[PDB]
């Protein structure tokens, strides 16, 4: 029993974090095999960041301009190239702690663990989800650039996020490990804002199933609904539309608890129109949307890595 | 910006988790140097958990009865002893991944990271606090016994908890790394219940200071209070009494925000009275009590 926002063990990722310094800028890098991946804004100065030309800035730089540090050992840069918004620094030494890995691009609603680092040294680990507006509600300070997001499936680490910047509202923006941003953002100091966010409907449903599995049933009712009627209700409360794919994905949870997905949708509809009335679900007064159906099954079963 | 329930990087602890098997029981162990520490209930069978005699059960065991596994390698047990409710198995090999460590006993209200393991293999990591009733609101299933709680302050790992059992209410009970339980609990299957829990007042105050540091002030008011008047109001909402030590501890946060601890206490008094009225503090509709003053300074300042 118990339900917590659980992160994947960070150990395999800790052995990859390095500190990257170019000029006056210092951020984090990911050292996999003989390459260090880091945000390309490590080459930017104060004047440069206003309107940067990264090809023009990079072409001036030589290998010795980049100081890469792995603990107390200095790694010597022997080459460099740019891939979208990420800088790939070829180093003379392959990381002996390189795990089995893949670079994956995740979709909004999907979750991942974040290893927050400062000066190539990891400080903490937390769990979070890619919001529908493509931002992440993370916990980051200046110097956290280059911190990575990941999932660990069996023994393989799937890198899905590299932190780049914070938006004026306190939320965070970054790219996949191939340099492509999540969201309509750019790596430049400019007026940018996160779009209006929405609630991840499929995840709230998964979390309602997790509450039922842990002995919380007060919110259940005898009623059911159609997917069409539920979506008209959810649209009014700024919830993401629920698709047939979401219904199929919630299948195993529906069978484990004996509550149909449309039956659970009718419970969610009552919570939206009437609230909790002084009650909580899994120790929360708000409807939690940062646990996917897969996270619920992995936590209420005990899967190891 | 941003405020999350953040755990310490688990890597140093992952390199210590082993699987311990005695008879039919299988749980987790902590391998530090040439010793494996695990809950002593690994020697108990079916008609043993009600009224076990651990000295009589252990005296019947030899070294070769304990199978210790570190990944795919089997560790050889060369000795054994019991320390309170923990079993210490001497092994022939010192752990090459043994970090710099200390065994610390924490007090109620204090927080720590938990590395949840099954069959000596870590599955997840989360943050949690020792509740005033000495239990932890954790996430554990059968096979999680021997999972450990820790803090990593600087480069040293401070082991403070080892998981032993789940109480009928869904909460968890365990010991420090010297086998002394936290709470009036026993490693028996007898009828045991967690005492009535209370809210960690000092932690809610620390979390209110964290909200002010992140730009939120709606809950502040023009009033102040005395410590005694605040405690009379707090006791009605099942809050732990706030002591002079708690006031001193909140000192740096009071100076950083410019808000006196007794003025922040008046905000909490009002919050308890009014609720939130459709508003949230740091993305929460409830008053969070699982972040200490130290956790707030760590996450907001460095
Ligand atoms: O360290 C940096 C570099 C910076 C600074 C602003 O100008 C830019 C412009 C573009 C880019 Cl890609 C990055 C940055 C940025 O957002 N961060 C941070 C990143 N995450 C959280 C943060 C919190 C507080 C201050 C900074 C933070
Ligand atoms: O694996 C064990 C052994 C056990 C089983 C019950 O009898 C006892 C009696 C004493 C002791 Cl020290 C441990 C146990 C126990 O609580 N757990 C668990 C531990 N954490 C969570 C759990 C959830 C669901 C089932 C079991 C759980
Ligand atoms: Cl303590």
Curated annotation (Swiss-Prot), chain A:
Changing residue 142 to A: Does not affect ability to cleave and inactivate human TRMT1. It is found in: Host cytoplasm; Host Golgi apparatus; Host nucleus. It catalyses: TSAVLQ-|-SGFRK-NH2 and SGVTFQ-|-GKFKK the two peptides corresponding to the two self-cleavage sites of the SARS 3C-like proteinase are the two most reactive peptide substrates. The enzyme exhibits a strong preference for substrates containing Gln at P1 position and Leu at P2 position. Inhibited by pyridone-containing alpha-ketoamides compounds 13a and 13b. In turn, alpha-ketoamide 13b (tert-butyl (1-((S)-1-(((S)-4-(benzylamino)-3,4-dioxo-1-((S)-2-oxopyrrolidin-3-yl)butan-2-yl)amino)-3-cyclopropyl-1-oxopropan-2-yl)-2-oxo-1,2-dihydropyridin-3-yl)carbamate) inhibits SARS-CoV-2 replication in human lung cells. Inhibited ex vivo by michael acceptor inhibitor N3. Inhibited ex vivo by compound 11a and 11b. The active site is at 41 (for 3cl-pro activity), 145 (nucleophile). There is a cross-link at residues 5, 90 (Glycyl lysine isopeptide (Lys-Gly) (interchain with G-Cter in ubiquitin)). Residues 1-305 are cytoplasmic. Residues 1-305 form the Peptidase C30 domain. 3CL-PRO exists as monomer and homodimer. Only the homodimer shows catalytic activity. Interacts with host FBXO22; this interaction promotes the proteasomal degradation of nsp5. Cleaves the C-terminus of replicase polyprotein at 11 sites. Recognizes substrates containing the core sequence [ILMVF]-Q-|-[SGACN]. Cleaves and inactivates human TRMT1, preventing tRNA guanine(26)-dimethylation of tRNAs. May cleave human NLRP1 in lung epithelial cells, thereby activating the NLRP1 inflammasome pathway. May cleave human GSDMD, triggering alternative GSDME-mediated epithelial cell death upon activation of the NLRP1 inflammasome, which may enhance the release interleukins 1B, 6, 16 and 18. Also able to bind an ADP-ribose-1''-phosphate (ADRP). This is 3C-like proteinase nsp5. It comes from Severe acute respiratory syndrome coronavirus 2 (2019-nCoV).
